[PDB]
Design a protein around this ligand. Structure first.
Ligand code: NAP
Length: 329
């Protein structure tokens, strides 16, 4: 395992991290959470991602119980929560000072920690001034309840606004953003966010590096019975991939699988290493519903030399989705 700075910050994250979306509290019960988390930790993963919205708090409860039982040195790992979806009522969601503060205190108790290393705004809230959210985060910094704060799937206008508010009012700037990023989804990391890396030093913990599992190639011939897209409650996700746009992407996945075979690598490994080939990626957050998948994904790290500039160019040619850079006149 190698480690990268989270943007310009001094926090060093393992290049692969481990998250809990979908799996914790359903596919992954309390005992399996402990097993997966210890396996990740023994492999050198030092960042574990969660959110208040994940199974309505139960993912964080399970992760906190695992953390307590496993007894890791607190200085040896990084844990997050993310605030946005904390219930159905108007004060239980969004990024108001009230819900940012309530959700932080609630996450501390669920995760059974005294502080969060990382605390993300899970989505942007167009109904709360970004200034208010930044002020709420700054109070949590000064109280010692969080160390770094950031955002997820914000746009570059919103992020630039947050940095400007922090500077104007003497508040703590954000550190980091958590965007989806994979061969099939590149718009924010390689497009919208491009100027923010040099301007602000924005770090990235990227989400869904296998496109919910599409980039394993496991769906090329149909839908496995034991697969995310077949889970009850995720019919919306099966639907998105059944659209014509989702079907064209799946046809490109077949070409990517042929490229991987040509290289002597699984498509899973190619897709994870592709993310790491971007120097603006601080960490790739892995997802796994079972130990064998975590082990498989960790094995990708042995094949870095197979992912060359020539391979990156061929992937660009297959998918055709490399975002345009800054425009000149
Ligand atoms: N902030 C956000 O908006 C956001 C959004 C998404 C994710 N995230 C974060 O990113 C983390 C990872 O996202 P993700 O779970 O979507 O990652 P992913 O790698 O795109 O999908 C992971 C899923 O694919 C299947 N899988 C993984 N490895 C496999 C393997 N080697 N072979 C076969 N199947 C495999 C498993 O699902 P099945 O076994 O059920 O098929 C696993 O649950 C999340 O836990 C979360 O921390 C954040």
């Amino acid at each position: 395992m190698e480690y990268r700075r989270l943007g310009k910050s001094g926090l060093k994250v393992s290049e692969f991290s481990f998250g809990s979306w979908v799996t914790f509290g359903k596919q992954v019960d309390g005992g399996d959470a402990k097993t997966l988390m210890q396996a990740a930790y023994d492999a050198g993963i030092n960042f574990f991602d969660n959110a208040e919205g994940y199974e309505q708090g139960n993912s964080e409860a399970l992760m906190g119980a695992a953390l307590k039982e496993l007894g890791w040195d607190r200085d040896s790992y990084i844990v997050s929560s993310k605030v946005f979806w904390g219930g159905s009522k108007p004060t239980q969601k969004g990024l108001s000072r009230k819900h940012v503060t309530d959700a932080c205190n609630a996450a501390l108790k669920r995760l059974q920690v005294d502080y969060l290393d990382l605390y993300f705004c899970h989505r942007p809230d167009v109904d709360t001034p970004i200034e208010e959210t930044v002020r709420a985060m700054d109070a949590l910094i000064t109280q010692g309840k969080i160390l770094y704060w950031g955002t997820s799937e914000w746009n570059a206008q919103q992020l630039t606004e947050a940095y400007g508010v922090a500077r104007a009012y003497g508040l703590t700037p954000p550190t980091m953003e958590q965007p989806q990023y994979n061969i099939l989804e590149r718009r924010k990391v390689e497009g919208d966010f491009l100027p923010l890396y040099e301007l602000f030093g924005l770090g990235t913990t990227i989400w869904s590096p296998l496109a919910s599992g599409i980039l394993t190639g496991k769906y090329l011939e149909g839908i496995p019975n034991d697969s995310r897209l077949n889970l009850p409650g995720y019919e919306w996700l099966k639907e998105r991939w059944s659209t014509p746009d989702g079907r064209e992407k799946q046809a490109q996945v077949r070409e990517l699988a042929d490229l991987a075979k040509e290289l002597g690598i699984s498509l899973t490994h190619l897709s994870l290493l592709w993310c790491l080939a971007n120097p603006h990626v601080s960490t790739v957050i892995l997802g796994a519903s079972r130990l064998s998948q975590l082990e498989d994904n960790l094995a990708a790290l042995a094949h870095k030399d197979k992912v060359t500039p020539e391979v990156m160019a061929r992937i660009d040619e297959i998918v055709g989705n490399k975002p345009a850079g800054p425009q000149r006149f």
